[PDB]
DNA sequence: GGTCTAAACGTCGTATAGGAGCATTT
DNA sequence: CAAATGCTCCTATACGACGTTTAGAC
């Protein structure tokens, strides 16, 4: 069974809360209203939505040109929204979340097929993701988008958020350099990463602390980067062994921890072994 | 002076990010 | 009938993941 605050962390990273307008002729206010929650990955990883559906209890799963679960009839989200506010989010999707919940509540008592919780939903939708469309814009104009709470004084919750987050977003990969100053002509480094844009900082440098290394970088998105071979090798690889990296990007770890034993015990210094190195690295990530 | 690590710097293609909307069931 | 929700297709840009250069220890 997969941890409750791996999904959350994971959902942290790549899901998203949506609420759709549609023009209706059917409808007194002349619009229909309806909210979803909805993860969606390659098709490859589709195992990782099975895990989700069986936690929760709850959700419906797709594989077309993508995989996904979704949630959009009122019970299914009233999972959604259980499991959230027992284990709740800490990027700037907290504030979607917010969003959401009051949207979702206003349509649960059915208060959307009203002139007024239309408008007071819209007000929601406008600040939440990309806002209004140009059609929307249309035909709400004067809408005041509703006040938007920044979290921003939110730590860490619990080592399998961050496996959670990486497994989704973060990344593993072999940096090799040519490089003459080196005996082998190539400089060859193990990498971790995490990227977000710069709205969400605290988080990465928060992260940094929960990990105790890796450096905070801005170029806008910010890098989260540890190259630091004892930091990997003594501090990196132990948590996501713990706290386990899950779907494909397992695999690539896996390759990941492999390159860095090697190049711990120097064989990275020699041909045979940057050769080695190579086929590992190019069937690592997309090279799969 | 040479070799190396850490990390600063550079960069493009696509896996999503977010969306819209018709068809079916309740 | 209408309100809900099942079901599917769309578009483009923020990432991932790949590559070079530099600061500086030894
Ligand atoms: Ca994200
Ligand atoms: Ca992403
Ligand atoms: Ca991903």
Redesign the pocket.
Known sequence: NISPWTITGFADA?S?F?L????DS???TGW???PRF?I???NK?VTILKSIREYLGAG?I?S???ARI?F?????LEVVINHFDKYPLITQKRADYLLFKKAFYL?KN?E??TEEGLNQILTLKAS????L?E??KEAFPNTIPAERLLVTGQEIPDSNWVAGFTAA?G?????????S????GY???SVF?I???TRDIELMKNLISYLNCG?I?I?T?VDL??????DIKEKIIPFFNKNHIIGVKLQDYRDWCKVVTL?DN?E??TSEGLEKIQKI?EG????R
């Open positions: 790549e998203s949506m759709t307008v549609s023009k059917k409808r007194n229909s209203v309806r909805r969606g990955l390659h990883d419906i797709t077309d040109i993508d979704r959009e009839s009122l019970k299914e349509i059915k959307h097929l939440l993701n990309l806002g469309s059609e929307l977003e990344s593993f990969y072999i940096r090799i350099a040519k490089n100053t080196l005996k082998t400089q060859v480094q990463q990227t977000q844009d450096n970088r170029r998105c980067v540890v190259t630091n071979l004892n190049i120097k990275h210094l690295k690592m990530n997309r090279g």
